[PDB]
Amino acid sequence: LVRYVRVLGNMVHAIQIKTKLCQLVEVMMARRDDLSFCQEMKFRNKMVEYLTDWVMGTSNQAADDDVKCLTRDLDQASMEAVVSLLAGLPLQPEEGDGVELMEAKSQLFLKYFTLFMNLLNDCSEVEMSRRLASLRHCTVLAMSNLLNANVDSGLMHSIGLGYHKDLQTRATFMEVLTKILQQG
């Protein structure tokens, strides 16, 4: 279903389809316990790969059209899908190339972490207030779920949030790390 909507293109019409599909993926992950999956893990990773491509910020200013402000909502809607998908998902790299499994994960973690970080800097108010506040909140909640499942392969890359520039963002990273220690 995504591939067809992936190639649909960009337009006021085709954008609304992408939004609604993203909302379906969120509702599909509230019933995951009821459904049946042949390979749950191998399927959740691909969806994240296919959905991260759609979160593109600052694309409504370059387009120079306010009619495409929906892309702001698409990023807002897209992240909520990525949060729900990522909740409890160990990473597993596609075996398209022959490399060490441990190395491939650490490389994979940094691939998504930098993506969120870049989107986090843009959302700063100094750089609509409700939109940025909501999107910024999601962008950190998504990052927390990414770290919890993959502490071993992603803790080193993540320490830099301790001295981040956004005070509200530093508190969240500390609350997350408090939980991780307490768990046995």
């Binding site: 320490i159 301790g162 005070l167 508190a171 609350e175 408090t178």
Partner: protein, 142 residues
């Protein structure tokens, strides 16, 4: 996480002196977890909680905890100082004055590591010293 008790300990102490009332409280809770998980020995007692109103002028409190840990927790020294220096540059002017206050007690513990059977820890101390040398050159006002 169990291999870096010293790297986290600097994050808790740096942010306890922050200016956001909801970032001191979050940092207090992190400090509580560290002592229990790692059996760090401090003077008083700490109890995790939510809703605390921690005052802004929280300076002599940090210096008291840091001084205690340095006295009776030396092995954390090397990885603690490396982080404190790295946190010096990124912080603002006012927080720079804080890092000096609670950094000094640790310096006295470099004695043992300087001649640690050339176990490559000796190469580490010289790395810290060269870092201090760079702060002095740049921070003219202080």
């Amino acid at each position: 996480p169990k291999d870096v008790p010293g790297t986290l300990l600097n994050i808790a102490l740096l942010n306890l002196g922050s200016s956001d009332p909801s970032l001191r409280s979050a940092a207090y809770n992190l400090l509580c977890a560290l002592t229990c998980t790692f059996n760090l020995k401090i003077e008083g007692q700490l109890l995790e909680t939510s809703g605390l109103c921690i005052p802004a002028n929280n300076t002599l409190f940090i210096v008291s905890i840091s001084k205690t840990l340095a006295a009776n927790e030396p092995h954390l020294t090397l990885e603690f100082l490396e982080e404190c220096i790295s946190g010096f540059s990124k912080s603002s002017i006012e927080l720079k004055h804080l890092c000096l206050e609670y950094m000094t007690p640790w310096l006295s513990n470099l004695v043992r590591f300087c001649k640690h059977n050339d176990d490559a820890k000796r190469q580490r101390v010289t790395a810290i010293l060269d870092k201090l040398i760079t702060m002095t050159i740049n921070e003219k006002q202080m």
